[PDB]
Amino acid sequence: FLPIIINLKALAALAKKIL
């Protein structure tokens, strides 16, 4: 239920998420 497109954003959000 999670499109591959969000993976990109997810990864970017992640970087900003932990810091």
Side-chain angles (χ1 to χ4, degrees):
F1 70 110
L2 304 182
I4 317 299
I5 321 297
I6 335 310
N7 285 244
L8 291 56
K9 324 303 159 147
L11 252 55
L14 159 151
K16 277 81 219 313
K17 201 274 295 311
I18 77 259
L19 251 163

Short mmCIF file of all heavy atoms in Angstrom, two decimals:
data_model
loop_
_atom_site.label_atom_id
_atom_site.label_comp_id
_atom_site.label_asym_id
_atom_site.label_seq_id
_atom_site.Cartn_x
_atom_site.Cartn_y
_atom_site.Cartn_z
N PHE A 1 0.86 -1.22 0.00
CA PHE A 1 0.00 0.00 0.00
C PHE A 1 0.88 1.25 0.00
O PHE A 1 0.39 2.37 0.18
CB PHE A 1 -0.91 -0.01 1.24
CG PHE A 1 -0.10 0.23 2.50
CD1 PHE A 1 -0.23 1.44 3.18
CD2 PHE A 1 0.79 -0.75 2.97
CE1 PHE A 1 0.52 1.68 4.35
CE2 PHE A 1 1.54 -0.51 4.14
CZ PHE A 1 1.40 0.71 4.82
N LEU A 2 2.18 1.07 -0.20
CA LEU A 2 3.11 2.20 -0.22
C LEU A 2 3.80 2.28 -1.58
O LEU A 2 4.67 1.46 -1.89
CB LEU A 2 4.17 2.03 0.88
CG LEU A 2 3.48 1.88 2.24
CD1 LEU A 2 4.56 1.76 3.33
CD2 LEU A 2 2.61 3.10 2.52
N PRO A 3 3.44 3.23 -2.40
CA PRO A 3 4.05 3.39 -3.75
C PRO A 3 5.57 3.58 -3.68
O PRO A 3 6.10 4.12 -2.71
CB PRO A 3 3.38 4.62 -4.36
CG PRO A 3 2.59 5.27 -3.26
CD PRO A 3 2.41 4.25 -2.14
N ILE A 4 6.25 3.13 -4.72
CA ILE A 4 7.71 3.23 -4.78
C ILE A 4 8.17 4.69 -4.77
O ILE A 4 9.30 4.99 -4.39
CB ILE A 4 8.23 2.54 -6.05
CG1 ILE A 4 7.50 1.20 -6.25
CG2 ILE A 4 9.74 2.27 -5.91
CD1 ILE A 4 7.75 0.29 -5.05
N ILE A 5 7.29 5.58 -5.19
CA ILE A 5 7.64 7.00 -5.24
C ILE A 5 7.89 7.55 -3.84
O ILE A 5 8.78 8.38 -3.64
CB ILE A 5 6.51 7.79 -5.90
CG1 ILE A 5 5.93 7.00 -7.09
CG2 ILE A 5 7.06 9.13 -6.41
CD1 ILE A 5 7.00 6.81 -8.17
N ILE A 6 7.10 7.10 -2.87
CA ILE A 6 7.26 7.60 -1.51
C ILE A 6 8.58 7.15 -0.90
O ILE A 6 9.08 7.77 0.03
CB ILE A 6 6.09 7.15 -0.62
CG1 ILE A 6 4.85 6.87 -1.48
CG2 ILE A 6 5.75 8.25 0.38
CD1 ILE A 6 4.58 8.05 -2.42
N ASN A 7 9.14 6.08 -1.44
CA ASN A 7 10.41 5.56 -0.92
C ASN A 7 11.46 6.66 -1.00
O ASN A 7 12.24 6.86 -0.07
CB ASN A 7 10.89 4.36 -1.75
CG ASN A 7 10.07 3.12 -1.42
OD1 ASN A 7 10.60 2.14 -0.89
ND2 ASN A 7 8.79 3.10 -1.69
N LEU A 8 11.46 7.37 -2.11
CA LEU A 8 12.39 8.46 -2.33
C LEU A 8 12.19 9.53 -1.27
O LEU A 8 13.13 9.94 -0.59
CB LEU A 8 12.13 9.10 -3.69
CG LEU A 8 12.52 8.15 -4.83
CD1 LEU A 8 11.79 6.81 -4.70
CD2 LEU A 8 12.13 8.79 -6.15
N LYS A 9 10.95 9.97 -1.16
CA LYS A 9 10.60 11.01 -0.20
C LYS A 9 10.80 10.49 1.20
O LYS A 9 11.31 11.19 2.08
CB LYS A 9 9.14 11.44 -0.40
CG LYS A 9 8.77 11.40 -1.89
CD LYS A 9 9.73 12.30 -2.70
CE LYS A 9 9.72 11.88 -4.18
NZ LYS A 9 9.91 13.07 -5.05
N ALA A 10 10.41 9.24 1.40
CA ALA A 10 10.55 8.59 2.68
C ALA A 10 12.01 8.62 3.12
O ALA A 10 12.32 8.94 4.28
CB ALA A 10 10.09 7.14 2.56
N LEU A 11 12.90 8.30 2.19
CA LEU A 11 14.34 8.31 2.47
C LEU A 11 14.80 9.72 2.78
O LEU A 11 15.62 9.93 3.68
CB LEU A 11 15.11 7.76 1.26
CG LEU A 11 15.66 6.36 1.58
CD1 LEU A 11 14.51 5.44 2.03
CD2 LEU A 11 16.32 5.78 0.33
N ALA A 12 14.28 10.69 2.04
CA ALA A 12 14.65 12.08 2.28
C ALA A 12 14.08 12.56 3.61
O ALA A 12 14.78 13.21 4.39
CB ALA A 12 14.12 12.98 1.15
N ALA A 13 12.83 12.22 3.87
CA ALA A 13 12.21 12.61 5.13
C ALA A 13 13.00 12.00 6.28
O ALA A 13 13.24 12.65 7.30
CB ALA A 13 10.76 12.11 5.18
N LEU A 14 13.40 10.75 6.09
CA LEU A 14 14.18 10.03 7.08
C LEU A 14 15.42 10.83 7.48
O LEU A 14 15.65 11.06 8.66
CB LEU A 14 14.60 8.67 6.49
CG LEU A 14 15.80 8.10 7.23
CD1 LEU A 14 15.75 6.58 7.16
CD2 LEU A 14 17.10 8.58 6.58
N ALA A 15 16.20 11.24 6.48
CA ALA A 15 17.42 12.00 6.75
C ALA A 15 17.12 13.21 7.62
O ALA A 15 17.84 13.50 8.58
CB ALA A 15 18.05 12.47 5.44
N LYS A 16 16.06 13.91 7.28
CA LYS A 16 15.66 15.08 8.04
C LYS A 16 14.98 14.67 9.35
O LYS A 16 14.85 15.48 10.27
CB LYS A 16 14.70 15.94 7.21
CG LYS A 16 15.50 16.84 6.26
CD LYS A 16 15.91 16.04 5.01
CE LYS A 16 17.33 16.42 4.59
NZ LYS A 16 17.47 17.90 4.58
N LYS A 17 14.53 13.43 9.41
CA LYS A 17 13.83 12.93 10.59
C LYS A 17 14.78 12.67 11.75
O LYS A 17 14.50 13.08 12.88
CB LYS A 17 13.11 11.63 10.23
CG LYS A 17 11.97 11.36 11.23
CD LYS A 17 12.51 10.62 12.46
CE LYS A 17 13.00 9.22 12.07
NZ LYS A 17 11.96 8.55 11.24
N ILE A 18 15.88 11.98 11.50
CA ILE A 18 16.83 11.66 12.57
C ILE A 18 17.65 12.88 12.96
O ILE A 18 18.36 12.86 13.97
CB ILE A 18 17.76 10.51 12.16
CG1 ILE A 18 18.84 11.00 11.19
CG2 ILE A 18 16.92 9.41 11.49
CD1 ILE A 18 18.48 10.63 9.75
N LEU A 19 17.56 13.94 12.17
CA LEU A 19 18.31 15.16 12.45
C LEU A 19 17.59 16.37 11.85
O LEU A 19 17.74 16.66 10.66
CB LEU A 19 19.71 15.05 11.85
CG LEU A 19 20.74 14.89 12.97
CD1 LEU A 19 22.06 14.37 12.39
CD2 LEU A 19 20.99 16.25 13.65
#
